[PDB]
């Protein structure tokens, strides 16, 4: 009840209580008013983190050693455009029976929590984590941090979130700046570092 | 009290707890009959004063650098007309270490940060003093009333100790803030008709009066 | 004096239909509840008995409705500046067709995007939009882009309004009510200022650029508007006495100001127009003229009038009490004021579509035939509707605010004490040119048939002749020099004069003789207007009781019948009065446009050549042939349909396919009309018995429409249908010749 | 919003949202197929 607001001096919404990990009373739609919109938010929003933090490490890491020269990789705009082992569609029709089958468990679970945690083959296995959209199990927390007090886990699981969501504002401005200025996204930072006055849109 | 074009309406409200009151309403803007939206007469006040303490701040920055110039103490390339220093390209401009539109920018982030939490003063009293703001939300308490927040930021001298001088000086500011936004208003008009700064225009009123006089100017 | 926050803002009463009313908030037993939710929908006065609610609700609806106008303007600007061939048309505006709206090619639909001109396909418009940008000096689509933004911000600016005067600040009923200062400020500020403004911009704008266009400069070499502003020194070249700026006007000296404030009359020889000078000069006198009128009623102030005390003052021998009391009436009902500013508006729109066809006030506009008789057409049937419209709401009055215990008046009383003498003296009226006026076609009909053409009512065998209008027209036309000395030239060329203006090869306009057709058509005008009144007056006249119903006032205002009694009650409600008006209104504009429509292309509009001879598009033949019905028949309506019935294959083949549609939509509402309710109740009985039979059958039990409905469905369709086959047919007649 | 989903459900906007994608389905079926008079296969 006393936590920072993103409006200081204003009121959180009824529906935000501040038990969520990231929660700072920011609705002013109101887009999660009833719970299970609430949920089916946390869940998109969590496996949006996590699809924009790879997406950002993919395509900043490698244009940055690229422009230092030490590798020699295409831009990330058109890598779509190169020619591989087999034409797109086939692999784009891999990717779907992979990730149907990889999300497809994943929609059980929020459905019917903890219906999906063993293995259909060697039921001597199987996931560890309470929790929908955290998992565990020695296949995602291998290292066994992903457990604990509800302070251990409060903190690791904002530290999550806080850094999902900085990742999709750099992803998407990625985007735009390779549509606008018509150039790699480390070019732009050389350019408004060497200017800064002036290296602006 | 003294009174200024004052009627038996404007009279019925304008009791004299408001610093620099005459009674002077004509049309009747703060009846407190049916007070509601912007015409409020506790934020009729409140804009009077901060209307007038910003255009007390533009009305000499908008001659200081002009002055300077003619007195010869200031670089000619940076003695220039306040409507050719930028703020119309059209009329003129000067370059800065960044272009216009990105200062425009910065000024707009920073203006926001300050005028909302003004804002939410107001409509909090004492919000502002609770959340963490590097610390500094120590000092920036209020004082519940929104036109006098007082403390160590805002009154650092600590003067207006008795509260006869807090009186006086509130008149003085209330006066000083209407002579200003007087002034104001002869800037932008006294502009569009002689083209030409306000300082050169006094400076063309003492040379001749009558040959360079609106009769002569309009 | 306002009320902060009075309705919260949410979605809840959304998914409750019919919450404004509590019959309808129950639930849909039946089908009537859906049916019954929208015919209600905007009837306030029955949601809440509380003025000041009613009036906050009103207040809101009127920002939606300008949001709506302004998108549609934007709408309108943006179609020019995209999709338009007008930069092409301002080169050649008598050579080239305006078009504004182009076809995707779908379904091989694209036949419509036929040749227009300029190296452009697709829809001709015929509203006239090109006339009024060219007009204003607009010469780059650049500037249509700039007015279409700006509309949509004022657009979402007057929603914004909308929300905000009804859930932040929503006025009370004081200030409502404050009809001096209302009247103040719409002739001082909205008429007065902005005839100022527009007079301000013709003066720095219009006037330089068209004098650019009409010397034959090229538009891409004319100088913007904001070099005229900036340079004196141009518009001193074009304007001398600019030189002298504002000196004149404050001295008086005001005659030097002729050279832009001219007084001519007439039309400019170049683009077939009015002279932008005098249209300036009337704009500045209207604005002192609004501006000088909006300083009579009292405010705060002391000075000016009281509209009680000047209504309390006007009272007779004859009339006993006078206005004394209708200021309360006025003040209280919101029902009469919207019936008396609708009838005013209509015979404005009336009076508006009558002026612009013989003064035609836009370059190039009166050699564009197709752009003068839509306008006109339009502009006469919004009149008529907005028309009827106010008697219907002055019976709605009549019906529910009608108390003489708190609210009397003598001269309502007085009407409503000898409605008798007044009815029956309009019925011998109407029978009197019924007889008089169609009466004479049958003698033509009945005498040509006959074989006896010399006992015709014709301009060979027995004139009529319509001296009176002869008389004005010759007093119009000799007014230069005798009774307006000021003025150079007659208002209108139509009065007489003799001077013909051509502009391009065809005819702009000329003098209009007047015979023994025009005074037949005329009564014919006066007979059905005289009929739509008697209908419409009896309906408002015994809205209360009758004879046959003393407690009418008691079944309301919209009610079938009182059942088969006192040898039967079919439609005594005033709300038939209405239903049974409309269809005279229909007629009376009919004939009206028909006739607007031969006398032009008959005896104005055609061709001219070189050696100055006149060939009219149907040669004259109104004079001879209008006299009969048969004339009708065959020279109007056989000959003219034949550009529609045979625009198949062509780029016109829309109007003709909206032809075909148009009559059987029209023919379609026959069936509501001619039959009743119990039948198709009990049809539906049958049909509900085989869904029963397949376990089908719906929970909202089917029910047919009410008697009221029926009715209203069946005057909907047929007025649909009508005015749809006249503009199908106008259109395609009118473009292709 | 459960208030604002009710509101979607409703009968004429339900019919609108599907009479619409209807008609664009049918468009684009006689833009990839045009003139269609017998069923060949
Ligand atoms: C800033 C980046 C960041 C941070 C701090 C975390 C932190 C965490 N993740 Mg994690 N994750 C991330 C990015 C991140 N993740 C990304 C980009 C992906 C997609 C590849 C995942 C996919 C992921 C899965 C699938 C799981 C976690 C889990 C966890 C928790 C225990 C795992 C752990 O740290 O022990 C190291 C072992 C911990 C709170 C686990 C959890 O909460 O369950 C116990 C879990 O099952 N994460
Ligand atoms: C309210 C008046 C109004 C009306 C009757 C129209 C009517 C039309 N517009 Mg339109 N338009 C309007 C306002 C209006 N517009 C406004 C205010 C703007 C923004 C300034 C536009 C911007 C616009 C564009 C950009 C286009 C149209 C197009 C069209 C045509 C096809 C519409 C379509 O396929 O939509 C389908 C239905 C949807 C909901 C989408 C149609 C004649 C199109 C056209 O003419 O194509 C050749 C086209 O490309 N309009
Ligand atoms: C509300 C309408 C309006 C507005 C805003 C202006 C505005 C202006 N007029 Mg103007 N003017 C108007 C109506 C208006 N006029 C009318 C109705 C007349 C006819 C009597 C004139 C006759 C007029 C003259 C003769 C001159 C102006 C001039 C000017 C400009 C300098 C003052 C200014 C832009 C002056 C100008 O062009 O200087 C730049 C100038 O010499 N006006
Ligand atoms: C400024 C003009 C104006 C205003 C504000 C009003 C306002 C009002 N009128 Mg009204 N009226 C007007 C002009 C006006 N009228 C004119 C000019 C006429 C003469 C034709 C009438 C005739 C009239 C009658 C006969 C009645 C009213 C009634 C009413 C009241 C209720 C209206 C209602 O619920 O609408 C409901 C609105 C509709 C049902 C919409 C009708 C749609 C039209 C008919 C067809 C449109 C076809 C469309 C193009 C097809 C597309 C369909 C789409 C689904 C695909 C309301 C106070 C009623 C009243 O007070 O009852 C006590 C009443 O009975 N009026
Ligand atoms: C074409 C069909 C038609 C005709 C001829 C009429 C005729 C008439 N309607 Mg009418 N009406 C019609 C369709 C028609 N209506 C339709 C479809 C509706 C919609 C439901 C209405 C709705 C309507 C209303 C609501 C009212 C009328 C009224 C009237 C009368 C107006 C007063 C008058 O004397 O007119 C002139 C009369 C004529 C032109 C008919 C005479 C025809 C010529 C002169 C032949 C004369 C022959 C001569 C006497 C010798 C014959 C002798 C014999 C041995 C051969 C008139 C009789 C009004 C009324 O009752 O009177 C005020 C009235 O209030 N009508
Ligand atoms: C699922 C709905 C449904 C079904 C199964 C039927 C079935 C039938 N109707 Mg029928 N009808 C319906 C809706 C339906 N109707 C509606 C909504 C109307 C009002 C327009 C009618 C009006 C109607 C008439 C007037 C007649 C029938 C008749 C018949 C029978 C003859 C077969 C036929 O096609 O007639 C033709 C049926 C039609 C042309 C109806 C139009 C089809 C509508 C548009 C379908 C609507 C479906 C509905 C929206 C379902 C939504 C599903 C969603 C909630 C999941 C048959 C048993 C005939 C009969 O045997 O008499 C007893 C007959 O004369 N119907
Ligand atoms: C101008 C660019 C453009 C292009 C190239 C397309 C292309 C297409 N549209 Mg489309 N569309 C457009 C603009 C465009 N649209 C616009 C502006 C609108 C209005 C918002 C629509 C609304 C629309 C609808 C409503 C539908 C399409 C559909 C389709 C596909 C039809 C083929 C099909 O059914 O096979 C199957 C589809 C594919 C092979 C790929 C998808 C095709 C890929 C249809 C579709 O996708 O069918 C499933 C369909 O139902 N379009
Ligand atoms: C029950 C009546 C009926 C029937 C059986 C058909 C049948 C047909 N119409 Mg059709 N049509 C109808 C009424 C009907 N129409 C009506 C009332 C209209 C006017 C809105 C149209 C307007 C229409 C168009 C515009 C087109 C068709 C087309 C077609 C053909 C469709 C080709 C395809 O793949 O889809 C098909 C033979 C298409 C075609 O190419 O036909 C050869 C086509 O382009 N129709
Ligand atoms: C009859 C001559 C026209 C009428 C005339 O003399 O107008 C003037 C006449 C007398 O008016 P008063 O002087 O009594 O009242 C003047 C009004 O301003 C009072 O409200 O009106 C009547 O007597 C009623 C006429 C009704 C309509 C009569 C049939 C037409
Ligand atoms: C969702 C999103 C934006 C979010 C929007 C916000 C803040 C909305 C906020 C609000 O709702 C709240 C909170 C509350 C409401 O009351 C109000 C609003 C204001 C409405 C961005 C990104 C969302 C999604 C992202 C970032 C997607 C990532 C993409 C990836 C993984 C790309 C990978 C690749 O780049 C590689 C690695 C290599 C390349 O070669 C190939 C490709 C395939 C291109
Ligand atoms: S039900 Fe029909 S026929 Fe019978 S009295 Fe009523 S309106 Fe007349």
Not at chain 1, 139 to 168: H, Q, V, Y
Not at chain 1, 169 to 188: E, K, S
Not at chain 2, 11 to 38: N, Q, R, V
Not at chain 3, 304 to 333: C, M, N, R, V, W
């Amino acid at each position: 009840p006393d936590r920072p607001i993103w409006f200081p001096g204003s009121t959180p919404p009824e529906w935000l209580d501040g038990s969520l990990p990231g929660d700072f009373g920011f609705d002013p739609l109101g887009l999660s008013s009833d719970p299970d919109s609430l949920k089916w938010n946390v869940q998109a929003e969590i496996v949006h983190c996590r699809w924009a933090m790879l997406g950002a490490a993919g395509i900043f890491i490698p244009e940055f050693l690229t422009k230092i020269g030490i590798l020699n990789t295409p831009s990330w705009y058109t890598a779509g455009e190169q020619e591989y082992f087999t034409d797109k569609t086939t692999l784009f029709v891999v990717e779907l029976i992979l990730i149907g089958w990889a999300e497809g468990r994943r929609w059980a679970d929020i459905i019917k929590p903890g219906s999906v945690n063993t293995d259909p083959v060697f039921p001597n296995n199987k996931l560890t984590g309470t929790d929908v959209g955290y998992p565990g199990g020695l296949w995602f927390d291998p290292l066994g941090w992903g457990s604990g007090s509800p302070a251990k886990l409060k903190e690791l699981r904002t530290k999550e979130i806080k850094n999902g969501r900085l990742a999709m504002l750099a992803v998407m401005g990625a985007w735009f700046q390779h549509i606008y200025t018509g150039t790699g996204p480390i070019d732009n930072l050389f350019a408004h570092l060497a200017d800064p006055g002036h290296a602006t849109i | 009290r003294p009174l200024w074009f004052a009627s038996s309406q404007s009279l019925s409200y304008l009791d004299g707890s408001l610093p620099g009151d005459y009674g002077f309403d004509p049309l009747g803007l703060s009846d407190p009959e049916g007070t509601g939206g912007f015409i409020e007469p506790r934020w009729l006040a409140y804009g009077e004063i901060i209307n007038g303490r910003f255009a007390m701040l533009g009305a000499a920055g908008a001659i200081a650098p002009e002055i300077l110039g003619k007195a010869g103490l200031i670089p000619a390339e940076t003695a220039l007309p306040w409507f050719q220093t930028g703020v119309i390209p059209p009329a003129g401009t000067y370059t800065y270490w960044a272009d216009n539109y990105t200062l425009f920018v910065l000024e707009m982030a920073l203006m926001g940060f300050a005028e909302h939490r003004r804002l939410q003063d107001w409509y909090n009293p004492g919000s502002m003093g609770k959340q963490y703001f590097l610390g500094l939300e120590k000092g920036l308490a209020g004082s519940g009333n929104p036109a006098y927040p007082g403390g160590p930021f805002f009154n650092p001298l600590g003067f207006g100790k008795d509260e006869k001088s807090l009186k006086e000086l509130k008149l003085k500011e209330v006066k000083n803030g209407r002579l200003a936004m007087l002034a104001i208003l002869g800037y932008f008009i006294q502009g569009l008709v002689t083209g030409v700064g306000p300082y050169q225009n006094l400076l063309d009123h003492l040379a001749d009066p009558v040959n360079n006089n609106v009769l002569t100017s309009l | 004096l306002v009320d902060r926050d009075p309705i919260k803002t949410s979605f809840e009463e959304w998914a409750k239909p019919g919450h404004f009313s509590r019959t309808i908030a129950k639930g849909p037993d039946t089908t009537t509840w859906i049916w019954n939710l929208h015919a209600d929908a905007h009837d306030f006065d029955s949601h809440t008995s509380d003025l000041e609610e009613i009036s906050r609700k009103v207040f809101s609806a009127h920002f939606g409705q300008l949001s709506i106008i302004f998108l549609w303007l934007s709408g309108m600007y943006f179609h020019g500046a995209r999709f338009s061939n007008y930069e092409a048309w301002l080169s050649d505006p008598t050579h080239i067709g305006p078009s504004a709206q182009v076809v995707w090619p779908i379904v091989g639909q694209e036949i419509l995007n036929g040749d227009v001109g300029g190296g452009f396909r697709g829809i001709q418009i015929t509203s006239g939009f090109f006339q009024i940008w060219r007009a204003s000096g607009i010469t780059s689509e650049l500037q249509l882009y700039c007015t279409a933004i700006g509309a949509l911000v004022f657009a979402a600016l007057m929603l914004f309004a909308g929300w905000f005067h009804y859930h932040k600040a929503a006025p009370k009923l004081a200030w409502f009510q404050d009809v001096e200062s209302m009247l103040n400020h719409h002739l001082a500020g909205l008429l007065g200022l902005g005839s100022l403004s527009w007079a301000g911009h013709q003066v720095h704008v219009s006037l330089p650029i068209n004098q650019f266009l009409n010397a034959g400069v090229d538009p891409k070499e004319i100088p913007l508007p904001h070099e005229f502003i900036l340079n004196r020194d141009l518009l001193a070249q074009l304007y001398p006495s600019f030189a002298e700026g504002a000196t004149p006007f404050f001295t008086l000296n005001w005659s030097k100001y002729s050279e832009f404030l001219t007084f001519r009359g007439g039309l400019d020889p170049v683009t077939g127009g009015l002279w932008l000078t005098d249209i300036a000069h009337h704009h500045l006198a209207i604005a002192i003229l609004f501006l000088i009128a909006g300083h009579m009623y009292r405010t705060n102030w002391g000075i000016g009038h009281g509209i009680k005390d000047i209504l309390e003052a006007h009272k007779g021998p004859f009339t006993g009490q006078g206005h004394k009391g209708l200021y309360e009436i006025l003040t209280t009902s919101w029902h009469a004021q919207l019936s008396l500013n609708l009838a005013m508006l209509g015979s404005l729109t009336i009076i508006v579509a009558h002026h612009m066809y013989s003064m035609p006030p836009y370059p190039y506009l009166a050699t564009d035939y197709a752009t003068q008789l839509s306008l006109f057409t339009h502009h006469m049937w919004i009149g008529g509707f907005l028309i009827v419209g106010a008697a219907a709401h002055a019976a709605i009055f009549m019906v529910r605010d009608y108390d003489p215990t708190n609210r009397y008046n003598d001269l309502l009383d007085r009407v409503l004490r000898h409605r008798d003498a007044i009815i029956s003296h309009l019925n011998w009226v109407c029978i009197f040119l019924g007889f008089h006026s169609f009466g004479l076609y049958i003698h033509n009909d009945t005498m040509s048939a006959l074989g006896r053409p010399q006992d015709m009512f014709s301009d060979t065998a027995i004139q009529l002749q319509p001296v009176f209008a002869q008389w004005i027209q010759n007093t119009h036309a000799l007014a230069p020099g005798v009774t307006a000395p000021g003025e150079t030239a007659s208002t209108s060329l139509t009065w007489g004069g003799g001077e013909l203006v051509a502009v391009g090869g065809k005819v702009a306009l000329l003098p209009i003789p007047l015979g023994t057709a025009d005074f037949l058509v005329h009564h014919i005008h006066a007979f059905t207007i005289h009929v739509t009144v008697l209908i419409l007056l009896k309906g408002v006249l015994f809205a209360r009781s009758s004879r046959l119903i003393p407690d009418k006032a008691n079944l309301g205002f919209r009610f079938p019948c009182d059942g088969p009694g006192r040898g039967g009650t079919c439609q005594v409600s005033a709300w038939d009065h209405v239903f049974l008006g409309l269809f005279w209104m229909y007629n009376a504009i009919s004939v009206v446009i028909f006739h607007f429509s031969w006398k032009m292309q008959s005896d104005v509009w055609g061709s001219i050549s070189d050696q100055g001879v006149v060939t009219h598009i149907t040669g004259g033949n109104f004079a001879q042939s209008s006299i009969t019905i048969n004339g009708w028949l065959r020279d109007f309506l056989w000959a003219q349909a034949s550009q529609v019935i045979q625009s198949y294959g062509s780029s016109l083949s829309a109007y003709g396919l909206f032809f075909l549609g148009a009559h059987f939509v029209w023919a379609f509402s026959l069936m509501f009309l001619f039959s009743g309710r119990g039948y198709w109740q009990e049809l539906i009985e049958s049909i509900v018995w085989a869904h029963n039979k397949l376990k089908v059958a719906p929970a909202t039990q089917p029910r047919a429409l009410s008697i009221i409905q029926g009715r209203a469905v069946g005057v909907t369709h047929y007025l649909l249908g009508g005015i749809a086959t006249t503009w199908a047919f106008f259109l395609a007649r009118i473009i292709a010749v | 919003m459960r208030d604002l989903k009710t509101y979607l459900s409703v009968a004429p906007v339900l019919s609108t949202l599907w009479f619409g994608s209807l008609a664009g389905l049918l468009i684009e079926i006689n833009r990839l197929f045009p003139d269609a008079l017998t069923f060949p296969f």
